[PDB]
Design a binder for these strands. Structure first.
Lengths: 119, 114, 56, 139
RNA sequence: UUGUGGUAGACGAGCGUUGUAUUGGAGUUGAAGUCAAAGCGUGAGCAUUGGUGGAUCCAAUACAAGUGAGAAUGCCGGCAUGAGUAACGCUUGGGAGUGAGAAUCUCCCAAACCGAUUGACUAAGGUUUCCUGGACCAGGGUCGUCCUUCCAGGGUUAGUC
RNA sequence: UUCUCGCAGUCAGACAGUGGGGGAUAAGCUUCAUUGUCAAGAGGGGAAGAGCCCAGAUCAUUAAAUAAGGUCCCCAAAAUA
RNA sequence: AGGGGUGAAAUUCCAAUCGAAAUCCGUGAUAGCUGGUUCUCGUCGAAAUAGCUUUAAGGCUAGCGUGAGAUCACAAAUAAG
RNA sequence: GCGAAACAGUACCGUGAGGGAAAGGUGAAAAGAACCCAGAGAUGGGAGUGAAAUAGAUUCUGAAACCAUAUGCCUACAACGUGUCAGAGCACAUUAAUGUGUGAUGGCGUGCGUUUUGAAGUAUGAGCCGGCGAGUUAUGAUAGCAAGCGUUAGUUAACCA
RNA sequence: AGUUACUAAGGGCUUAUGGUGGAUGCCUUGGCACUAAUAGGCGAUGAAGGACGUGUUAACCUGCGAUAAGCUUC
């Protein structure tokens, strides 16, 4: 069609995925639409898997998947991760994070869900 | 000298619509539609009043000729037997009602023997 | 294309008969007195009976 | 056993509240609250307050047991609406109705009063026939 | 005895309502209007009764009609229908807090768009739409705790423009 | 079915039969005259059908004789040679 | 500035509309052409033909129906000759 | 009824000439729903004033169209301008009467005005509902019926008390 | 195998309950036609009419006009 909304194509979704994995690494809990958590779970688990090794090549690789926040910078988040979160989940084969279905949103009754993680 | 007839028209339409009832759905809710339904129902009721007497005699002819041909004789035979000798006024409906009267039709069949 | 004649109240109600909804789901939460529907969190700060969040 | 409570036509279409309340009508009060809380509808929020106020009125004002009470019936009536205008292409205007619904509910503590209204109507028709027949006593 | 098909059309006999006028009556011990029920009529109509109802009527007679509603692509008004249907008219997320209520409120963070433009002085014009405090019945194409929305209190200052 | 008086109404007819003309004794066509129908009046037969046939309806009949027409069944209504 | 203007001209434009804008009035212009026209009942109850017509959709007269009176059998029909 | 009973040529529209709105009734005295409860409030329920809140500010009543709701009955093999004549059974019991409601099922049955020679019509109009909505008057003549007078009567125009 | 229980998602009939709308009914500080007496102009000493301002009273209507929701004589 002619001039209208630009849409929410897969590039926008994956950008939001990077934003949200950065946010959950910053805090440890994110409440949002369930469907987005379902897609971002795989990428988050892959990033956690790559966070165990702490090798400069792997640091360069994960450099492409963080952002800038106010709580911590990209370097600060990375060093905090590689310092304490990496050995925390070194004993389990996956399933480091859980998505729990919350109540529908007030606005569009979207099925809300919380992604969380703990040892 | 303004003259209003709102109440008169409302009463007239109310008494017109009082006749119409038991129609299908919303049909007994519109004055103009119910008028036509009532008129058509009245005309068809007059037609049925005219033709039910027309068809009831044929119905009794069926219901009596059943018994007659069950005895081995057509309704024509019975009409002829009545016609020539011992002419009766017993109606086709009443002779048909004689079926509902036990031990009577045999009396007619034995009486008409000649 | 367009509608030619108006429908009837009974006919439109029969059409709307499929607009009716079915019953929802309802499960039981023991520690927090509440009937929360199945595969959902509990407002008392838990999911099912496992405590995971704040009591809200 | 009615304990009615009114709200007098807040903005809600009958088409949207009728079905949901008829789905919720005819049950107890606690399970009604449980299912209405788990209902993602504006009607749920609009009716939760009404139900709570009705229960409070029945318990306090009417002195009803509450434990034996249940939602007697839905009555989602034609509340007054609003008429607004909207621009339309080729330089025209269109009229749109913002629909509202009168809100009122009934609660019964007994499996009856459906037939008690029948008794009241029977008494009414008996007084009617009495008034009609005693007129014949004026001979 | 003829009888009681009938348009146009002719002819005849009546009924309903208002008002005026005379004779009457009822009426907060309930009038009219309204709805309803299981009457009388050749029909214009006449009732009867139940209740809303809360102060007007009806009966008999002449006179005079803004007098007798089935349509007029009739006038207005109300109501559905279509129909929960298309659309919401050039666009994201997270955190924290407040709020009864958080995608829509505040703050912070980011992501994204234009950047000879989505910048800024300013004109015409809008003519207070401006600011603050409080609130969100009436509109926000839902939303609202907010808005250019409402109330209260303020606000444009010239010898050199 | 005479005259006068008052009020009219209609001329855009059609169909069937007869005698035609035109058209082609083509046309559910046109033009005509005549005999009937509908219009202006329904009903039965005709498979349902305005003009065909029988027929002319105050109303009620769960009464009789019938007309046209029909009698294996649908659907009342017969058989013998 | 509208039996006016304007128009590199097309019957262009003159407030999204113009063989000549809109506004108020004469004007309630006219409408053989369309459309409609609101209580009951009784009785009788045709024509779609002819002539005329700047006339064929229209209008005038006849014929016809109806109502009142008279004529009331010399009148009119129905059969017979 | 003046467009205007209501703060009306007001609101509003077209730039503008110009055109041009709707709407009255609490009650008897606010005598305005005190007090309590749910609810943030609105709102509602009790409670009170008030004869009365079927007088609660939507405040004389609250018809029709429309929306539901359930008493009872029926409907998921069913070809009906949707109904008639009947009728099983079911539940009742009235303006007490061969009663009412309702109908498993049988027979029968292709809307209203419109104009045409004519429409179930694929000819047109009508969504429905409520009000409103279209042969009057002034004068004169003619015709009918009745009356007054009545064979030079009747009758006044105008004008006056 | 054969009759209907029971079925109704829903709808229809009958009956009334509540809801909108102000229809009908009743009334009028309003319009309309008049009847009888008066009268038939105002204004440059600046008209009617508008805008503005004036109140313990915010706003409107209204009154008046910086002497301002009013004064003096009788």
């Amino acid at each position: 069609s002619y001039i209208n909304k630009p849409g929410k194509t897969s590039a926008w979704r994956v950008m939001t995925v990077r934003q949200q994995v950065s946010a959950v690494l910053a805090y440890g809990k994110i409440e949002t639409t369930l469907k987005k958590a379902k897609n971002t779970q795989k990428r988050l688990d892959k990033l956690i898997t790559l966070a165990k090794v702490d090798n400069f090549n792997n640091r360069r690789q994960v450099k492409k998947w963080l952002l800038n926040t106010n709580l911590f910078d990209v370097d600060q988040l990375m060093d905090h991760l590689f310092s304490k979160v990496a050995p925390k989940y070194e004993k389990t084969p996956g399933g480091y994070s859980r998505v729990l279905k919350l109540g529908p949103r007030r606005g569009d009754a979207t099925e809300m869900a919380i992604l969380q993680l703990t040892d | 000298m303004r003259i209003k007839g709102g109440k008169q028209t409302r009463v007239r339409r109310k008494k017109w619509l009082k006749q119409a009832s038991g129609s299908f759905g919303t049909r007994h809710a519109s004055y103009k539609v119910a008028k036509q339904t009532v008129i058509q129902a009245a005309k068809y009721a007059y037609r049925d009043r005219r033709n039910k007497k027309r068809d009831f005699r044929s119905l009794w002819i069926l219901r009596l000729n059943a018994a007659l041909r069950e005895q081995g004789m057509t309704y024509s035979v019975f009409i002829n037997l009545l016609k020539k000798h011992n002419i009766e006024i017993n109606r086709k409906v009443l002779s048909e009602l004689a079926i509902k009267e036990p031990s009577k039709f045999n009396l007619i069949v034995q009486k008409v023997k000649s | 294309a367009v509608q030619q004649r108006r429908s009837s109240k009974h006919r439109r109600d029969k059409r709307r008969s499929h607009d009716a909804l079915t019953a929802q789901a309802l499960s039981v939460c023991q520690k927090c007195g509440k009937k929360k529907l199945f595969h959902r969190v509990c407002s008392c700060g838990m999911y099912g009976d496992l405590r995971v969040k704040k009591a809200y | 056993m009615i304990a009615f409570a009114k709200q007098f036509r807040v903005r809600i279409s009958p088409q949207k509240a009728r079905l949901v309340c008829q789905l919720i009508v005819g049950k107890k009060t606690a399970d009604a609250q449980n299912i209405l809380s788990n209902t993602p509808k504006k009607a749920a929020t609009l009716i939760a307050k009404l139900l709570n106020s009705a229960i409070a009125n029945a318990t306090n004002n009417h002195g009803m047991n509450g434990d034996a009470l249940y939602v007697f019936e839905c009555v989602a009536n034609q509340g007054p609406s609003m008429k607004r205008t909207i621009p339309r292409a080729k330089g025209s205007s269109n009229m749109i109705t913002k629909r509202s619904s009168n809100l009122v509910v009934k609660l019964s503590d007994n499996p009856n009063e459906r037939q008690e209204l029948i008794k009241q109507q029977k008494a009414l028709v008996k007084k009617r026939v009495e008034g009609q027949q005693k007129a014949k006593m004026a001979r």
